[PDB]
Amino acid sequence: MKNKVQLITYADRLGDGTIKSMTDILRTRFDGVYDGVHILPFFTPFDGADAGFDPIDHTKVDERLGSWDDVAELSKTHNIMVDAIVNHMSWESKQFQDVLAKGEESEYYPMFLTMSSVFPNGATEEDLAGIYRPRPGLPFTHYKFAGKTRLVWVSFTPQQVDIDTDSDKGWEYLMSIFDQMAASHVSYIRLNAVGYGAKEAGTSCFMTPKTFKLISRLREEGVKRGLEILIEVHSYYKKQVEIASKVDRVYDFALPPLLLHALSTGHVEPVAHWTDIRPNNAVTVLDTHDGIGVIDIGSDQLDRSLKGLVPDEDVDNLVNTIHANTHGESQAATGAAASNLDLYFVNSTYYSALGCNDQHYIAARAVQFFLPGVPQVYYVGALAGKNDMELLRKTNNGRDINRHYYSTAEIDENLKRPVVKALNALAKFRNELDAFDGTFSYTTDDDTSISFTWRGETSQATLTFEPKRGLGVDNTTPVAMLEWEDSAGDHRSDDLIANPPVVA
Ligand SMILES: OC[C@H]1O[C@H](Oc2cc(O)cc(/C=C/c3ccc(O)cc3)c2)[C@H](O)[C@@H](O)[C@@H]1O
Numbered sequence: 001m002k003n004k005v006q007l008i009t010y011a012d013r014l015g016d017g018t019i020k021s022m023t024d025i026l027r028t029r030f031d032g033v034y035d036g037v038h039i040l041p042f043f044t045p046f047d048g049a050d051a052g053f054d055p056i057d058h059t060k061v062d063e064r065l066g067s068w069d070d071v072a073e074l075s076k077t078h079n080i081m082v083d084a085i086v087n088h089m090s091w092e093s094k095q096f097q098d099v100l101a102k103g104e105e106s107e108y109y110p111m112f113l114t115m116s117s118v119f120p121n122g123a124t125e126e127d128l129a130g131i132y133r134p135r136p137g138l139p140f141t142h143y144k145f146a147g148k149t150r151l152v153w154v155s156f157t158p159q160q161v162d163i164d165t166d167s168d169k170g171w172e173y174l175m176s177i178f179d180q181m182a183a184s185h186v187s188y189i190r191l192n193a194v195g196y197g198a199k200e201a202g203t204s205c206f207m208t209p210k211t212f213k214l215i216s217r218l219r220e221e222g223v224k225r226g227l228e229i230l231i232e233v234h235s236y237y238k239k240q241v242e243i244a245s246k247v248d249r250v251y252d253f254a255l256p257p258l259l260l261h262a263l264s265t266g267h268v269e270p271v272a273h274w275t276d277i278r279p280n281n282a283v284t285v286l287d288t289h290d291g292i293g294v295i296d297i298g299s300d301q302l303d304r305s306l307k308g309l310v311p312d313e314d315v316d317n318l319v320n321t322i323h324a325n326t327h328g329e330s331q332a333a334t335g336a337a338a339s340n341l342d343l344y345f346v347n348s349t350y351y352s353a354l355g356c357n358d359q360h361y362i363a364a365r366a367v368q369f370f371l372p373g374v375p376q377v378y379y380v381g382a383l384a385g386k387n388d389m390e391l392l393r394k395t396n397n398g399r400d401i402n403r404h405y406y407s408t409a410e411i412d413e414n415l416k417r418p419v420v421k422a423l424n425a426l427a428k429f430r431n432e433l434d435a436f437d438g439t440f441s442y443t444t445d446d447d448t449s450i451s452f453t454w455r456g457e458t459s460q461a462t463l464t465f466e467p468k469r470g471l472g473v474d475n476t477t478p479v480a481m482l483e484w485e486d487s488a489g490d491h492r493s494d495d496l497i498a499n500p501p502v503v504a
Pocket of ligand 1: 344
């Protein structure tokens with residue numbers, strides 16, 4: 001993966017509402033800022049219950065958004081990342097409807113997992129209770145195979161039936177997806193829900209040896225087609241390290257909340273610890289298309305004795321801090337859970353989670369860019385967007401607080417703001433200075449300061465982070481200082497908003 005900043009966006013929520021418009025925005029307004037882009041699911045349909053992640057036909061671009069030729073066109077100027085939903089598919093797919101019609105006579109019967117698929121001999125209460133769950137309840141629902149009531153395996157909504165990733169038909173399906181991506185010049189694949197894609201009795205059916213075997217298989221097929229695979233998993237952080245040593249790339253989901261903690265308390269010891277131990281084959285983010293993950297720093301939710309990177313009280317305090325900084329906006333969008341340790345994500349734009357403090361936000365982005373890994377910027381964050389309460393009240397979908405629809409006009413108006421221009425200049429600095437292609441190091445004081453240094457063949461840079469200097473949501477004191485050396489000698493910026501860095 002190129003070591004350049006990428007954009008995460010919906011095709012229809014950035015510009016006029018099409019892949020062509022999104023491409024035009026990227027090329028005309030973010031040249032040199034975002035040299036790659038992760039296009040969120042744009043298949044048929046993109047506007048269902050789960051904003052494109054519940055496709056009926058994963059292989060056809062929604063004709064309202066564009067075509068695969070548009071993806072091919074975009075690939076000529078940007079590296080493209082796309083999702084591959086490998087664990088399940090719509091119960092409204094033609095295949096599953098065929099299984100409902102013909103049952104075991106269906107050509108696609110072996111393609112879908114049932115309880116009997118995994119437990120041909122019966123299952124114990126321990127067998128079923130031990131399955132790792134993103135949603136409450138057992139992963140089964142009732143469907144009728146031509147007349148016969150069957151329990152279909154469903155890791156998520158009952159409308160998303162899980163496929164047998166080990167069957168010939170299922171694998172054929174996955175490889176059809178891979179063949180289209182490969183045919184439209186996509187570079188990177190984000191394997192959605194891949195950790196659940198392998199089922200085996202007596203195990204958690206989540207990131208087991210079988211799951212890793214599946215991932216490696218998909219990897220070989222990808223490289224055979226020129227597609228690199230990215231793994232997405234929200235889990236207890238130690239499991240994240242473990243998984244990261246076994247795959248090409250994972251997300252760094254701990255950093256966003258770690259930076260919220262640092263900027264709200266001034267403590268940097270957790271950030272230094274995570275820096276020391278984190279997996280470096282990472283994609284770094286602050287905001288995503290989902291809510292802010294708190295489980296990723298995370299007392300283990302199956303065994304609360306394995307403590308996270310901060311005490312549980314600091315986790316509760318983090319959630320409450322987002323609530324306070326947003327003056328209750330996130331409370332309206334987050335479902336209450338009777339205890340903040342039970343929470344999975346907190347629905348708020350990152351900029352809003354910081355109380356819209358420009359200095360804090362630009363500092364967070366700087367840290368993100370200085371840690372090993374490819375940085376991604378979510379489009380809302382690319383425009384320093386606030387919580388969209390109108391859309392939330394319209395749809396009652398919590399996550400929509402962080403999924404504002406930006407018209408071209410709105411984009412151009414927000415591009416005049418100093419913090420946005422500071423982020424653009426910062427991403428240019430991160431994309432153009434070759435120091436970041438060299439070697440990484442860092443120093444720490446005890447709890448006040450931490451300095452990340454990259455040294456390269458023709459440049460060097462050190463970012464010093466000291467949140468202790470600028471406490472307060474209304475604070476305007478810079479909390480990040482930057483020194484770097486390029487063609488023009490040594491340079492220093494003590495305010496990344498007022499004095500964004502420019503490489504010679
Ligand atoms: O399609 C369903 C969703 O898939 C992805 O989200 C995931 C993908 C995944 O592999 C695991 C999870 C985990 C949920 C979860 C985890 C731990 C827990 O304790 C409770 C719940 C979420 C997309 O990004 C999201 O937009 C989409 O809606």
